[PDB]
From Swiss-Prot:
Gene3D superfamilies: 6.10.140.2100, 6.10.140.2110
Domain Globin: 1-147
Gene: MB
UniProt-annotated location(s): Cytoplasm, Sarcoplasm
The organism of origin for this protein: Sus scrofa (Pig)
Lineage: Eukaryota, Metazoa, Chordata, Craniata, Vertebrata
Protein name (database record): Myoglobin
Phosphoprotein is among the record's keywords: yes
Reaction(s) catalysed (UniProt annotation): Fe(III)-heme b-[protein] + nitric oxide + H2O = Fe(II)-heme b-[protein] + nitrite + 2 H(+); H2O2 + AH2 = A + 2 H2O
Length: 153
């Protein structure tokens, strides 16, 4: 959905995340939990973290962040011919974890805020715009799969 050029920007900033997937993954879930505390409640092993000090110290949080970003990089690498990899994710999220589309917007924001915080240099006006279109396509495709399995509610 982006131009070839926009995908390139997207894969190029993602190259930075790939050099530290779990430290970027940890910081994204801390930003999401801190930003929207209600999301935390969706996680049984984190539901009890009461502060950012406890979130930073959690081994499990760091793992789950690695898991989350590893899965999103597999989707981003397919540029948009990503139906196959998105499916299973829409399936588990809609049906087993029961994650509203709204929360996919909250995590897209937490992603942009960590790339901006960790790579101010590299994540300039054009990289930010290309990653925001890429996360919006992701969330639109997830919403599409949700309304299909017949959720969104
Ligand atoms: C960038 C968007 C996301 C991606 C790529 C992603 C990826 C994953 C993956 C790969 C798993 C493990 C497999 C599965 O159970 O499907 C998972 C589990 C899970 N996800 Fe997500 N996720 C995303 C967003 C969210 C959001 C926004 C929430 C909640 C606010 C969430 C809640 C959960 C929960 C509750 C589980 C089960 C965790 C566990 O095993 O205890 N996910 N997610």
């Amino acid at each position: 959905g982006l131009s070839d050029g926009e995908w390139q920007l997207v894969l190029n900033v993602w190259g930075k995340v790939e050099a530290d997937v779990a430290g970027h993954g940890q910081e994204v879930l801390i930003r999401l939990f801190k930003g929207h505390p209600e999301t935390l409640e969706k996680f049984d092993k984190f539901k009890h973290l009461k502060s950012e000090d406890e979130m930073k110290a959690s081994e499990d949080l760091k793992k789950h962040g690695n898991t989350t970003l590893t899965a999103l990089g597999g989707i981003l690498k397919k540029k948009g011919h990503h139906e196959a990899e998105l499916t299973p994710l829409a399936q588990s999220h809609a049906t087993k974890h029961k994650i509203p589309v709204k929360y996919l917007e909250f995590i897209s924001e937490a992603i942009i805020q960590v790339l901006q915080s960790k790579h101010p240099g590299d994540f300039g006006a054009d990289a930010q715009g290309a990653m925001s279109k890429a996360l919006e396509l992701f969330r639109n495709d997830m919403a599409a799969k949700y309304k299909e399995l017949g959720f969104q509610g």
